[PDB]
Amino acid sequence: AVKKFKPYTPSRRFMTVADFSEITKTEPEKSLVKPLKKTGGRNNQGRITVRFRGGGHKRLYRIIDFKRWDKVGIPAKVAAIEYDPNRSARIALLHYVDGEKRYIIAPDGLQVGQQVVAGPDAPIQVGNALPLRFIPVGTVVHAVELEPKKGAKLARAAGTSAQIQGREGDYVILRLPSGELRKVHGECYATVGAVGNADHKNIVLGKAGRSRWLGRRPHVRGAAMNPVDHPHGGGEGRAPRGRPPASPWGWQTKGLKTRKRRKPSSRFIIAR
Template sequence: KAGRNVNGHITMRHQGGGHKQHYRIVDFRRDKDGISAKVERLEYDPNRSANLALLCYADGERRYIIAAKGLAAGTQLLSGAEAPIKPGNTLPLRNIPVGTTVHCVEMQPGKGAQLARAAGASVQLLAREGSYAQVRLRSGEIRKVHVDCRATIGEVGNEEHSLESIGKAGRVRWRGVRPTVRGVAMNPIDHPHGGGEGKTAAGQDP
């Protein structure tokens, strides 16, 4: 069962069950430079809020990437320093104009994207000074990132993910989330709020 440690004790509540999922290997490095790729199709991914785009490169290789907003089947993409500035293309920060909205930003050159990967996420390139660039995250935090780190133009697609109505309790269970029991509904042994006849106020430790 999920959420248990080596002794079988629950260490993380509300985990378990859920539908079986296959993990999709996503290309966060985008290191096939200079080889054009065509978006074959957009796919759902149960492992993340964003959708995936399946790319077919000119040499026949296929890779998944995080689908940028505005991508559709048939879109041509390119990565590398020479790539044009259009959504879905990946370039080093040194080659991206200041003020551009980007996503899937690396924090160390060559490590793969770590920032702004969720549905609807984006960061803004604010400035470049020497070998570092400044990016503003959605939280308002401003981070310094090396200019050789790569970023993808545009923002992540599926931006209405947060507005989606789950509809029923069962859909939460499909995602592997178990119910949250209120402390007041428990016995005294299980919770400080537990026990009592009827509804009683929580006792305060003096």
């Protein structure tokens, strides 16, 4: 896990690369792929709406299955475990006995040659998707729908999971990857286990260029701007923040809480 390097150049000394042994064969890709339109940070006007983006390696989008219920009761063999350049996780190719091929984000511990299935039936086992209400309290679980039949929105990133803390009526209580305690509806599909590829957080980019490949252009401190540009611009040498620290748009960036208050989903939250 996490290949390291001898320092034969600087920046190779700190560099650390993911472990790809977990990847079954398939370097190449099932034509479940689809081209990615790269934005460059720019919105439909010609405009940067998210700074510092672009450059970075070309990517082919693997379409993946975030509703497992369209296929209730049809099992599938796990054919391949492969690299998805579009997410922190690895994806599983699974061949349904339907004959249909689909991508799943690959849970931790699911192996090639495995039997996988989704539905209220289902064994409680890695890879299976059930509605929440049928999953035994206290099992960790990932790929979770927030509302029924709208697709899996939670715990998708490498090594994330969520745990079932209990039930109340139509709804069940989850602990999310954040630590937030949330009511999710009983009917929402989740898929048991945890996302895996969890050494992911331990990679170390190691050189500037490697950050570039990931499409991330240099990030410059307001501190180094002039005041046309930022609240922290100015002042002869260096100088401190000189006001409570702010964004370029001037709102406060240390502690100041930005979630809408009167939001409806407040009723379904209990936590941090």
